[PDB]
Write a protein that binds this ligand. Structure first.
Ligand code: 105
Length: 263
């Protein structure tokens, strides 16, 4: 809706950074609204949803089990790993790792899951193999690149990410069970409260994943809708900014308030 683009443009000026935005109809996959849809932005933690998509694809092929337990040690821990930090003694199953990587943006959880599939290169291969030749993960956490446009490592575009997310939540790429599990983990997201969720009315459904960069980049991918069910996919990314985190969060929340008001 035009009013949402107003807030997106306001955000660019307020943040002194570029903002990428796209909203897709969940059923048809058609672009309902967009801004800088084909420009590249650092994916940051939003890649964790795609990673678990790759893991679920392996589960569907009988190459992985959600209940499989992975043991690890202190040497595997990296910053921003609130859940994995507490399971050095008993380990965590694959589903617990995806839950942690998605809902708490747990870095070590993401790395352990990356290891199960063969590394960043295999996540990129997984994406390439499903028709996404844009999105690329080149690094392990906590080292993702943010230096665009010179360096395109670890980037995506609003359009590529939205299209890919839709292909992981709908259609036949993943089984019904896997599609449902992926959106269920996203619905349980615990660290995206100041973003789209802050503007969400009671009774609305939202399944999302946030991202943040050391240089100030911020982003979010989501499937949301009224009456307790999702009907649109929204992806929002912002380049590096000198603006404070509170300000970055507020701008994204403002965009969401408009999206909701003019649904
Ligand atoms: B992912 O992007 O969510 C993982 N990384 C971060 O969240 C992050 C980065 C890249 O730089 N700081 C953070 C961070 C923030 Cl802003 C809040 C809480 C934990 C980590």
């Amino acid at each position: 809706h035009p009013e949402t683009l107003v807030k997106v443009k306001d955000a660019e000026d307020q943040l002194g950074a570029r903002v990428g935005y796209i909203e897709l109809d969940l059923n048809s996959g058609k672009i309902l609204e967009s801004f800088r849809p084909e420009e590249r932005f650092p994916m940051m933690s939003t890649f964790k949803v795609l990673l678990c998509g790759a893991v679920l694809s392996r589960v569907d092929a009988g190459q992985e089990q959600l209940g499989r337990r992975i043991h690890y040690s202190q040497n595997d821990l990296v910053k921003y790993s609130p859940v994995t930090e507490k399971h050095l003694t008993d380990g965590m199953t694959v589903r617990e790792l995806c839950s942690a990587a998605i809902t708490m943006s747990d870095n070590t959880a993401a790395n352990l899951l990356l290891t199960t599939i063969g590394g960043p290169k295999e996540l990129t291969a997984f994406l390439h193999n499903m028709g996404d030749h844009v999105t690329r993960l080149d690094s392990w956490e906590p080292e993702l690149n943010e230096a665009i446009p010179n360096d395109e490592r670890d980037t995506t575009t609003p359009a590529a990410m939205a299209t890919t997310l839709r292909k992981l939540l709908t259609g036949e790429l993943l089984t019904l069970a896997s599609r449902q599990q992926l959106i269920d983990w996203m619905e349980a997201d615990k660290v995206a409260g100041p973003l789209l969720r802050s503007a969400l009315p009671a009774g609305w459904f939202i399944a999302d994943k946030s991202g943040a960069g050391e240089r100030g980049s911020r982003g979010i991918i989501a499937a949301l809708g009224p009456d307790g069910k999702p009907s649109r996919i929204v992806v929002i990314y912002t380049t590096g900014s000198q603006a404070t985190m509170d300000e970055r969060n507020r701008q994204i929340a403002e965009i969401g308030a408009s999206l909701i008001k003019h649904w």
